[PDB]
Amino acid sequence: STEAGKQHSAISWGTGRAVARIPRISGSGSGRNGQGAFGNMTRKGHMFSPLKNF
Amino acid sequence: ASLKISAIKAMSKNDMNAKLIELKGELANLRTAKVTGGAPSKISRLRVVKKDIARLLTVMNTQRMEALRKYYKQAKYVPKELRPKTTRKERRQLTKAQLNLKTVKAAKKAQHFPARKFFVLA
Amino acid sequence: AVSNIHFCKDWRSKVHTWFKQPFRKIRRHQTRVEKAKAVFPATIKSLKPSVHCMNQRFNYKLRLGRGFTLKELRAAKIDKNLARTIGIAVDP
Amino acid sequence: TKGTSCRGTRHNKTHILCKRCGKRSWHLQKQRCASCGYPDAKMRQYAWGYKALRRRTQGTGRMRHLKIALKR
Amino acid sequence: TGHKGFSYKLKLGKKIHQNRGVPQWFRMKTGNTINYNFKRRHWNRRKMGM
RNA sequence: AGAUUUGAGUAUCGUAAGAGGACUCCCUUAACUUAAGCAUAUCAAUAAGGGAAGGAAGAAAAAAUAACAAUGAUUUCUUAAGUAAUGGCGAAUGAAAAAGAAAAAGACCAAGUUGAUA
RNA sequence: UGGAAGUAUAAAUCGAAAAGGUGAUAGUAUUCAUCAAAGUCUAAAUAUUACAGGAAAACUGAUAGCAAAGAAGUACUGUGAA
RNA sequence: GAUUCACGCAGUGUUAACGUGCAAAUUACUUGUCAUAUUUGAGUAUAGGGGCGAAAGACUCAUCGAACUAUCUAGUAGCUGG
RNA sequence: AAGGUUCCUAAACAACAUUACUUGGAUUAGGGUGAAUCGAUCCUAAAUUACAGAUGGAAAUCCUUAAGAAA
RNA sequence: GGGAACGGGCUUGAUUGGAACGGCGGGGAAAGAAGACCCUGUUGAGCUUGACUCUAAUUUAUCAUGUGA
RNA sequence: AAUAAAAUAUUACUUUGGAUAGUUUAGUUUCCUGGGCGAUGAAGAACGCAAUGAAUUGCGAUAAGUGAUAGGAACAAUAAAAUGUGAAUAUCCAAAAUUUGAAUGCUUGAAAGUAUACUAAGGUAUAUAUGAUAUUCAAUAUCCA
């Protein structure tokens, strides 16, 4: 799916917070918030260059 | 469920409503029996009568609606509840006759120069 | 060699894939077959003239055109109103 | 006093339940619903809110009178 | 509040109705995985936002 | 008083609205980015905003090409072709006739004529 | 806009015809070629990642594949958009 | 729009307590103030190159020398890590 | 105002209230909110929103009695 | 001592019994934070100004045919 | 010089945890057919209905279902009743279809409501724009007596 993994509105928290600069999910109230984002090394993100049907 | 459709269909118009008065009253006392600690046999009777009321009403409405359709079958102005079943789009599209209308000049040409049948020798 | 690639625009939404090409052959063929079954000379591909190509590059090659001129039908003694009904293309 | 202390006076509702979408998104002073776009006849939908489109749209409900029509 | 609209009280009452658990007989159906009602809330645990 | 003109209220029979917008036809003067800076340019009929429909929609019957031993409505595919051209002629942008195929179909208004005129 | 002394649209002004447009280097003239604008409809060949019903796969096999293989846009967060 | 005390309010000092706190700004004593340029509830009005400001670039939902949220967007990095 | 069954009773104490609990605003199950005179409903205040009209490429904006054979 | 010129580990020596309690604040160049001072990016943002290129508002001339001298 | 409480080392068994292996009623992509909504009230939202249901599912005051047509003996967690004189099950069918929603007599905040006409209650109609016809009018607007 062309939208797989990239269906979030995540931005990196920056520096100064003792956490890595990988983008992080936004909001609160769930365990998903504050977790990793699109990057291919994370969980539930996109993979390396995704397979294309063409 | 013990009312039978044959018994209902043979009833008169007044016997339709006369039975319904008793059936509603019978269920009304059965609702009290559920509240006041009734036996399971009385509870099973509650479920039966409810379907009897539904069964009785279905025949009452169908018979009257069928009579209504026979009333307005010849009527020029028919109520929307008796018009043929169609989607909103279908009732807006032109009829098959109107879609195939031809001008007199074009209609007469199709009768003088129609598509002839033929073949070619190889 | 100096490269000239017009991929700076969004080509991924400009990509057209021909996966329907094998099924296009079956669809078109089943229409020609089912057209003759209606009336066999329906797909007879009504007769077309033998016209020259344009430009000096192709001027010596003959190819099919569309429709005979009204002078060609008169030279061959054919009614122009009846020509279209017997599988003859006409181009006034 | 912008943190813990200032939260004590929050007892006046800004949004209440809306009549067309059922969400607590009806702004009382603005007299419009932030979610379903009330009295405005057209439902409020935006292309940037693609997730908001897949949460309330056709097929997310009972489809009481359209399930038969398409089946027919 | 003590004062409420008619529609608001009925939606208040339904929230009371839905704060219940699985009946015991339902838990004894064959192939049953529904043992708890995960849509449960308590007045001092979560506000229902209404 | 009467013959007309225009504009209203009421009654009857209908019509529009809203959902969906993957594909279709359009309105709008975004920016990040590239140019190793940047201001025209590129990104780019692109994003977001707005309107309208169908099962397809749009186009369609030359005030069209061409300069030939000439063609001939519209649509789509191959090729022409990263070519002619455009560009701080920088970065970059960039068609079309011919030629080969899929399918093929042409009909009307206005103007003119006929008026014991309908 | 590829259209370069203007390819197309629009606005201000101006504004034709005993017709005329085009032949992309502006201008006048004479020939030549080819059409006849400023009204309308028109099937077939073409597109489709809405949605519904099916069939396939050198696709993934529960941190993978849709966010969702269980009452998943559900639990939970925010005044709200989200 | 005098001087003070009280119910309250503020926040001058201890640069006291606490500083993985009762508390993402609180506590104790001390100090100032404690009705007309006063204190305060509800309703209502003003919205992002905008608003409001007895003016500190202050306040605009713990976010302000330009809020929050979603899309362009996997913005770009001659720089850092693998 | 806000909360929403937290109110009362009985059974029961696995979890929760930085020990423990026979206690509980915690678990389970029932019960409980009675109006001609109390309020909403009625009136208008700051302000707010409609048909027609005016404006705008557009969504929409303006006007609240002025423009209207309307109120 | 040498070493990246201030070692817990290396070299040479001084010296060492295993487990630890209450204190304290020398060291661990202690913890908290991809230095905020300085510099470099052909990286930005607020503000100012006859910095360059523009723009709303303002202003001026012509056009858009009311009649009679 | 000395012990092995602590400390360390390997193996076996147990524990906390859920990797690995086996598996799939779930997804992804392509293709084929359609692309069938709504004032005859749509999509969406709310409330309600099972003998014991909180969710979910199905349904709408005829309620986890009614009639008709096919269908032939079940359901089950526990009781009951009904049942080949027809149980489950199925459907482009019929009757029925609460409050709202373009929402449309007027108002609507979480608002309880309410006016007229027709056939005490119940049920219909009454929004805006709009095409055609009928009808009642207004304007010395053009004539004309």
mmCIF file of all heavy atoms in Angstrom, chain K residues 115-128:
data_model
loop_
_atom_site.group_PDB
_atom_site.id
_atom_site.type_symbol
_atom_site.label_atom_id
_atom_site.label_comp_id
_atom_site.label_asym_id
_atom_site.label_seq_id
_atom_site.Cartn_x
_atom_site.Cartn_y
_atom_site.Cartn_z
ATOM 1 P P A K 115 -50.940 25.784 20.134
ATOM 2 O OP1 A K 115 -52.031 26.386 20.941
ATOM 3 O OP2 A K 115 -50.947 24.325 19.861
ATOM 4 O "O5'" A K 115 -50.881 26.546 18.737
ATOM 5 C "C5'" A K 115 -50.869 27.964 18.684
ATOM 6 C "C4'" A K 115 -51.064 28.476 17.278
ATOM 7 O "O4'" A K 115 -49.876 28.221 16.485
ATOM 8 C "C3'" A K 115 -52.182 27.835 16.473
ATOM 9 O "O3'" A K 115 -53.464 28.346 16.796
ATOM 10 C "C2'" A K 115 -51.760 28.119 15.039
ATOM 11 O "O2'" A K 115 -52.076 29.455 14.679
ATOM 12 C "C1'" A K 115 -50.239 27.994 15.139
ATOM 13 N N9 A K 115 -49.764 26.657 14.733
ATOM 14 C C8 A K 115 -49.359 25.617 15.531
ATOM 15 N N7 A K 115 -48.989 24.554 14.861
ATOM 16 C C5 A K 115 -49.162 24.917 13.533
ATOM 17 C C6 A K 115 -48.947 24.231 12.325
ATOM 18 N N6 A K 115 -48.492 22.979 12.253
ATOM 19 N N1 A K 115 -49.219 24.882 11.174
ATOM 20 C C2 A K 115 -49.677 26.137 11.242
ATOM 21 N N3 A K 115 -49.919 26.886 12.314
ATOM 22 C C4 A K 115 -49.638 26.210 13.441
ATOM 23 P P U K 116 -54.773 27.442 16.574
ATOM 24 O OP1 U K 116 -55.931 28.157 17.166
ATOM 25 O OP2 U K 116 -54.456 26.061 17.020
ATOM 26 O "O5'" U K 116 -54.966 27.417 14.991
ATOM 27 C "C5'" U K 116 -55.292 28.601 14.279
ATOM 28 C "C4'" U K 116 -55.181 28.404 12.786
ATOM 29 O "O4'" U K 116 -53.843 27.952 12.448
ATOM 30 C "C3'" U K 116 -56.089 27.347 12.179
ATOM 31 O "O3'" U K 116 -57.410 27.811 11.960
ATOM 32 C "C2'" U K 116 -55.355 26.976 10.897
ATOM 33 O "O2'" U K 116 -55.582 27.951 9.891
ATOM 34 C "C1'" U K 116 -53.896 27.074 11.343
ATOM 35 N N1 U K 116 -53.338 25.763 11.747
ATOM 36 C C2 U K 116 -52.988 24.873 10.750
ATOM 37 O O2 U K 116 -53.129 25.116 9.564
ATOM 38 N N3 U K 116 -52.474 23.678 11.187
ATOM 39 C C4 U K 116 -52.271 23.294 12.496
ATOM 40 O O4 U K 116 -51.797 22.185 12.745
ATOM 41 C C5 U K 116 -52.653 24.272 13.468
ATOM 42 C C6 U K 116 -53.159 25.442 13.070
ATOM 43 P P A K 117 -58.644 26.783 11.992
ATOM 44 O OP1 A K 117 -59.899 27.568 11.897
ATOM 45 O OP2 A K 117 -58.441 25.860 13.137
ATOM 46 O "O5'" A K 117 -58.488 25.943 10.647
ATOM 47 C "C5'" A K 117 -58.710 26.546 9.381
ATOM 48 C "C4'" A K 117 -58.451 25.581 8.252
ATOM 49 O "O4'" A K 117 -57.037 25.262 8.188
ATOM 50 C "C3'" A K 117 -59.131 24.225 8.361
ATOM 51 O "O3'" A K 117 -60.486 24.256 7.941
ATOM 52 C "C2'" A K 117 -58.246 23.338 7.493
ATOM 53 O "O2'" A K 117 -58.550 23.522 6.119
ATOM 54 C "C1'" A K 117 -56.861 23.926 7.765
ATOM 55 N N9 A K 117 -56.137 23.189 8.818
ATOM 56 C C8 A K 117 -55.927 23.592 10.112
ATOM 57 N N7 A K 117 -55.246 22.736 10.830
ATOM 58 C C5 A K 117 -54.986 21.698 9.949
ATOM 59 C C6 A K 117 -54.299 20.484 10.109
ATOM 60 N N6 A K 117 -53.733 20.114 11.256
ATOM 61 N N1 A K 117 -54.212 19.660 9.044
ATOM 62 C C2 A K 117 -54.787 20.045 7.896
ATOM 63 N N3 A K 117 -55.461 21.163 7.623
ATOM 64 C C4 A K 117 -55.527 21.960 8.705
ATOM 65 P P C K 118 -61.528 23.148 8.460
ATOM 66 O OP1 C K 118 -62.861 23.477 7.896
ATOM 67 O OP2 C K 118 -61.372 23.009 9.930
ATOM 68 O "O5'" C K 118 -61.030 21.797 7.779
ATOM 69 C "C5'" C K 118 -61.143 21.598 6.378
ATOM 70 C "C4'" C K 118 -60.509 20.298 5.952
ATOM 71 O "O4'" C K 118 -59.109 20.281 6.334
ATOM 72 C "C3'" C K 118 -61.078 19.041 6.590
ATOM 73 O "O3'" C K 118 -62.268 18.600 5.961
ATOM 74 C "C2'" C K 118 -59.927 18.053 6.470
ATOM 75 O "O2'" C K 118 -59.870 17.506 5.161
ATOM 76 C "C1'" C K 118 -58.715 18.966 6.663
ATOM 77 N N1 C K 118 -58.199 18.950 8.052
ATOM 78 C C2 C K 118 -57.447 17.853 8.488
ATOM 79 O O2 C K 118 -57.247 16.920 7.696
ATOM 80 N N3 C K 118 -56.963 17.838 9.751
ATOM 81 C C4 C K 118 -57.203 18.867 10.564
ATOM 82 N N4 C K 118 -56.711 18.820 11.802
ATOM 83 C C5 C K 118 -57.961 19.998 10.146
ATOM 84 C C6 C K 118 -58.433 19.999 8.894
ATOM 85 P P U K 119 -63.378 17.802 6.802
ATOM 86 O OP1 U K 119 -64.568 17.616 5.934
ATOM 87 O OP2 U K 119 -63.522 18.475 8.118
ATOM 88 O "O5'" U K 119 -62.722 16.371 7.048
ATOM 89 C "C5'" U K 119 -62.421 15.507 5.962
ATOM 90 C "C4'" U K 119 -61.628 14.307 6.414
ATOM 91 O "O4'" U K 119 -60.371 14.740 6.994
ATOM 92 C "C3'" U K 119 -62.266 13.461 7.504
ATOM 93 O "O3'" U K 119 -63.230 12.551 7.004
ATOM 94 C "C2'" U K 119 -61.065 12.781 8.146
ATOM 95 O "O2'" U K 119 -60.632 11.682 7.359
ATOM 96 C "C1'" U K 119 -60.009 13.883 8.058
ATOM 97 N N1 U K 119 -59.923 14.685 9.301
ATOM 98 C C2 U K 119 -59.214 14.158 10.364
ATOM 99 O O2 U K 119 -58.669 13.069 10.324
ATOM 100 N N3 U K 119 -59.168 14.954 11.480
ATOM 101 C C4 U K 119 -59.742 16.196 11.641
ATOM 102 O O4 U K 119 -59.610 16.791 12.712
ATOM 103 C C5 U K 119 -60.454 16.674 10.498
ATOM 104 C C6 U K 119 -60.515 15.922 9.395
ATOM 105 P P A K 120 -59.297 19.699 19.459
ATOM 106 O OP1 A K 120 -59.282 18.398 18.741
ATOM 107 O OP2 A K 120 -59.824 20.907 18.776
ATOM 108 O "O5'" A K 120 -60.109 19.502 20.817
ATOM 109 C "C5'" A K 120 -61.150 18.542 20.913
ATOM 110 C "C4'" A K 120 -60.871 17.536 22.001
ATOM 111 O "O4'" A K 120 -61.932 16.546 22.041
ATOM 112 C "C3'" A K 120 -59.603 16.715 21.829
ATOM 113 O "O3'" A K 120 -58.442 17.402 22.261
ATOM 114 C "C2'" A K 120 -59.906 15.459 22.635
ATOM 115 O "O2'" A K 120 -59.734 15.700 24.023
ATOM 116 C "C1'" A K 120 -61.398 15.277 22.355
ATOM 117 N N9 A K 120 -61.646 14.376 21.213
ATOM 118 C C8 A K 120 -62.336 14.672 20.065
ATOM 119 N N7 A K 120 -62.405 13.679 19.213
ATOM 120 C C5 A K 120 -61.716 12.655 19.845
ATOM 121 C C6 A K 120 -61.431 11.334 19.457
ATOM 122 N N6 A K 120 -61.824 10.803 18.298
ATOM 123 N N1 A K 120 -60.721 10.567 20.313
ATOM 124 C C2 A K 120 -60.328 11.103 21.477
ATOM 125 N N3 A K 120 -60.534 12.329 21.952
ATOM 126 C C4 A K 120 -61.244 13.066 21.079
ATOM 127 P P A K 121 -57.017 17.081 21.591
ATOM 128 O OP1 A K 121 -56.059 18.138 22.003
ATOM 129 O OP2 A K 121 -57.236 16.814 20.147
ATOM 130 O "O5'" A K 121 -56.571 15.717 22.278
ATOM 131 C "C5'" A K 121 -55.361 15.080 21.899
ATOM 132 C "C4'" A K 121 -55.531 13.587 21.786
ATOM 133 O "O4'" A K 121 -56.924 13.261 21.550
ATOM 134 C "C3'" A K 121 -54.794 12.930 20.631
ATOM 135 O "O3'" A K 121 -53.426 12.699 20.918
ATOM 136 C "C2'" A K 121 -55.597 11.657 20.401
ATOM 137 O "O2'" A K 121 -55.242 10.662 21.350
ATOM 138 C "C1'" A K 121 -57.019 12.131 20.708
ATOM 139 N N9 A K 121 -57.771 12.511 19.496
ATOM 140 C C8 A K 121 -58.397 13.708 19.257
ATOM 141 N N7 A K 121 -59.003 13.772 18.097
ATOM 142 C C5 A K 121 -58.766 12.528 17.532
ATOM 143 C C6 A K 121 -59.147 11.965 16.302
ATOM 144 N N6 A K 121 -59.872 12.608 15.384
ATOM 145 N N1 A K 121 -58.751 10.702 16.038
ATOM 146 C C2 A K 121 -58.023 10.057 16.959
ATOM 147 N N3 A K 121 -57.605 10.478 18.150
ATOM 148 C C4 A K 121 -58.014 11.738 18.383
ATOM 149 P P G K 122 -52.288 13.302 19.957
ATOM 150 O OP1 G K 122 -50.989 13.230 20.673
ATOM 151 O OP2 G K 122 -52.767 14.608 19.439
ATOM 152 O "O5'" G K 122 -52.238 12.277 18.742
ATOM 153 C "C5'" G K 122 -52.127 10.881 18.977
ATOM 154 C "C4'" G K 122 -52.617 10.083 17.797
ATOM 155 O "O4'" G K 122 -54.056 10.213 17.676
ATOM 156 C "C3'" G K 122 -52.093 10.516 16.439
ATOM 157 O "O3'" G K 122 -50.794 10.017 16.172
ATOM 158 C "C2'" G K 122 -53.158 9.991 15.486
ATOM 159 O "O2'" G K 122 -52.976 8.603 15.246
ATOM 160 C "C1'" G K 122 -54.429 10.172 16.316
ATOM 161 N N9 G K 122 -55.151 11.415 15.983
ATOM 162 C C8 G K 122 -55.297 12.526 16.777
ATOM 163 N N7 G K 122 -56.000 13.469 16.212
ATOM 164 C C5 G K 122 -56.343 12.948 14.972
ATOM 165 C C6 G K 122 -57.101 13.515 13.917
ATOM 166 O O6 G K 122 -57.644 14.625 13.870
ATOM 167 N N1 G K 122 -57.207 12.643 12.838
ATOM 168 C C2 G K 122 -56.652 11.389 12.782
ATOM 169 N N2 G K 122 -56.863 10.699 11.652
ATOM 170 N N3 G K 122 -55.942 10.850 13.758
ATOM 171 C C4 G K 122 -55.829 11.680 14.816
ATOM 172 P P G K 123 -49.745 10.897 15.333
ATOM 173 O OP1 G K 123 -48.426 10.215 15.379
ATOM 174 O OP2 G K 123 -49.856 12.306 15.785
ATOM 175 O "O5'" G K 123 -50.287 10.813 13.839
ATOM 176 C "C5'" G K 123 -50.501 9.559 13.212
ATOM 177 C "C4'" G K 123 -51.221 9.724 11.899
ATOM 178 O "O4'" G K 123 -52.581 10.167 12.133
ATOM 179 C "C3'" G K 123 -50.641 10.772 10.966
ATOM 180 O "O3'" G K 123 -49.538 10.273 10.230
ATOM 181 C "C2'" G K 123 -51.836 11.159 10.103
ATOM 182 O "O2'" G K 123 -52.032 10.208 9.067
ATOM 183 C "C1'" G K 123 -52.993 11.035 11.100
ATOM 184 N N9 G K 123 -53.381 12.325 11.703
ATOM 185 C C8 G K 123 -53.039 12.766 12.959
ATOM 186 N N7 G K 123 -53.527 13.940 13.245
ATOM 187 C C5 G K 123 -54.246 14.300 12.115
ATOM 188 C C6 G K 123 -54.991 15.476 11.842
ATOM 189 O O6 G K 123 -55.173 16.452 12.579
ATOM 190 N N1 G K 123 -55.565 15.440 10.577
ATOM 191 C C2 G K 123 -55.430 14.403 9.688
ATOM 192 N N2 G K 123 -56.054 14.545 8.511
ATOM 193 N N3 G K 123 -54.735 13.302 9.929
ATOM 194 C C4 G K 123 -54.170 13.313 11.154
ATOM 195 P P U K 124 -48.562 11.275 9.446
ATOM 196 O OP1 U K 124 -47.298 10.558 9.143
ATOM 197 O OP2 U K 124 -48.515 12.555 10.196
ATOM 198 O "O5'" U K 124 -49.321 11.536 8.074
ATOM 199 C "C5'" U K 124 -48.890 12.561 7.198
ATOM 200 C "C4'" U K 124 -50.026 13.092 6.365
ATOM 201 O "O4'" U K 124 -51.222 13.219 7.177
ATOM 202 C "C3'" U K 124 -49.812 14.483 5.801
ATOM 203 O "O3'" U K 124 -49.019 14.481 4.630
ATOM 204 C "C2'" U K 124 -51.232 14.980 5.586
ATOM 205 O "O2'" U K 124 -51.789 14.416 4.410
ATOM 206 C "C1'" U K 124 -51.945 14.369 6.791
ATOM 207 N N1 U K 124 -52.020 15.282 7.959
ATOM 208 C C2 U K 124 -52.575 16.553 7.849
ATOM 209 O O2 U K 124 -53.006 17.041 6.814
ATOM 210 N N3 U K 124 -52.590 17.269 9.023
ATOM 211 C C4 U K 124 -52.141 16.854 10.264
ATOM 212 O O4 U K 124 -52.218 17.602 11.238
ATOM 213 C C5 U K 124 -51.602 15.533 10.296
ATOM 214 C C6 U K 124 -51.569 14.816 9.172
ATOM 215 P P A K 125 -47.655 15.322 4.595
ATOM 216 O OP1 A K 125 -46.791 14.765 3.525
ATOM 217 O OP2 A K 125 -47.144 15.410 5.987
ATOM 218 O "O5'" A K 125 -48.128 16.775 4.153
ATOM 219 C "C5'" A K 125 -48.986 16.943 3.036
ATOM 220 C "C4'" A K 125 -49.658 18.290 3.053
ATOM 221 O "O4'" A K 125 -50.723 18.305 4.036
ATOM 222 C "C3'" A K 125 -48.777 19.462 3.447
ATOM 223 O "O3'" A K 125 -47.978 19.919 2.371
ATOM 224 C "C2'" A K 125 -49.787 20.491 3.942
ATOM 225 O "O2'" A K 125 -50.387 21.174 2.853
ATOM 226 C "C1'" A K 125 -50.845 19.596 4.592
ATOM 227 N N9 A K 125 -50.692 19.501 6.057
ATOM 228 C C8 A K 125 -50.185 18.452 6.780
ATOM 229 N N7 A K 125 -50.188 18.652 8.075
ATOM 230 C C5 A K 125 -50.735 19.918 8.217
ATOM 231 C C6 A K 125 -51.009 20.710 9.346
ATOM 232 N N6 A K 125 -50.759 20.329 10.600
ATOM 233 N N1 A K 125 -51.558 21.926 9.145
ATOM 234 C C2 A K 125 -51.809 22.309 7.887
ATOM 235 N N3 A K 125 -51.597 21.656 6.747
ATOM 236 C C4 A K 125 -51.052 20.452 6.982
ATOM 237 P P U K 126 -46.458 20.375 2.620
ATOM 238 O OP1 U K 126 -45.733 20.294 1.328
ATOM 239 O OP2 U K 126 -45.932 19.638 3.798
ATOM 240 O "O5'" U K 126 -46.590 21.911 3.007
ATOM 241 C "C5'" U K 126 -47.411 22.785 2.246
ATOM 242 C "C4'" U K 126 -47.790 24.005 3.044
ATOM 243 O "O4'" U K 126 -48.730 23.632 4.083
ATOM 244 C "C3'" U K 126 -46.652 24.676 3.795
ATOM 245 O "O3'" U K 126 -45.893 25.544 2.973
ATOM 246 C "C2'" U K 126 -47.371 25.385 4.934
ATOM 247 O "O2'" U K 126 -47.948 26.600 4.480
ATOM 248 C "C1'" U K 126 -48.500 24.400 5.243
ATOM 249 N N1 U K 126 -48.167 23.481 6.355
ATOM 250 C C2 U K 126 -48.450 23.893 7.642
ATOM 251 O O2 U K 126 -48.949 24.973 7.896
ATOM 252 N N3 U K 126 -48.123 22.992 8.624
ATOM 253 C C4 U K 126 -47.559 21.745 8.451
ATOM 254 O O4 U K 126 -47.322 21.044 9.436
ATOM 255 C C5 U K 126 -47.299 21.392 7.092
ATOM 256 C C6 U K 126 -47.607 22.250 6.118
ATOM 257 P P A K 127 -44.411 25.134 2.512
ATOM 258 O OP1 A K 127 -44.016 26.024 1.391
ATOM 259 O OP2 A K 127 -44.363 23.663 2.330
ATOM 260 O "O5'" A K 127 -43.506 25.490 3.771
ATOM 261 C "C5'" A K 127 -43.471 26.807 4.300
ATOM 262 C "C4'" A K 127 -42.053 27.278 4.485
ATOM 263 O "O4'" A K 127 -41.202 26.132 4.738
ATOM 264 C "C3'" A K 127 -41.420 27.962 3.284
ATOM 265 O "O3'" A K 127 -41.739 29.341 3.224
ATOM 266 C "C2'" A K 127 -39.933 27.696 3.481
ATOM 267 O "O2'" A K 127 -39.380 28.609 4.416
ATOM 268 C "C1'" A K 127 -39.950 26.309 4.119
ATOM 269 N N9 A K 127 -39.760 25.220 3.144
ATOM 270 C C8 A K 127 -40.665 24.243 2.816
ATOM 271 N N7 A K 127 -40.224 23.388 1.930
ATOM 272 C C5 A K 127 -38.937 23.830 1.664
ATOM 273 C C6 A K 127 -37.940 23.346 0.805
ATOM 274 N N6 A K 127 -38.103 22.270 0.034
ATOM 275 N N1 A K 127 -36.765 24.008 0.767
ATOM 276 C C2 A K 127 -36.615 25.087 1.546
ATOM 277 N N3 A K 127 -37.477 25.638 2.395
ATOM 278 C C4 A K 127 -38.634 24.954 2.407
ATOM 279 P P U K 128 -41.974 30.068 1.812
ATOM 280 O OP1 U K 128 -42.316 31.485 2.086
ATOM 281 O OP2 U K 128 -42.897 29.232 1.008
ATOM 282 O "O5'" U K 128 -40.541 30.037 1.119
ATOM 283 C "C5'" U K 128 -39.476 30.842 1.603
ATOM 284 C "C4'" U K 128 -38.226 30.641 0.789
ATOM 285 O "O4'" U K 128 -37.738 29.287 0.969
ATOM 286 C "C3'" U K 128 -38.389 30.774 -0.717
ATOM 287 O "O3'" U K 128 -38.385 32.118 -1.163
ATOM 288 C "C2'" U K 128 -37.229 29.949 -1.253
ATOM 289 O "O2'" U K 128 -36.014 30.676 -1.164
ATOM 290 C "C1'" U K 128 -37.179 28.810 -0.237
ATOM 291 N N1 U K 128 -37.944 27.618 -0.674
ATOM 292 C C2 U K 128 -37.329 26.735 -1.540
ATOM 293 O O2 U K 128 -36.200 26.907 -1.964
ATOM 294 N N3 U K 128 -38.082 25.643 -1.896
ATOM 295 C C4 U K 128 -39.364 25.350 -1.477
ATOM 296 O O4 U K 128 -39.924 24.327 -1.878
ATOM 297 C C5 U K 128 -39.929 26.308 -0.580
ATOM 298 C C6 U K 128 -39.218 27.378 -0.217
#
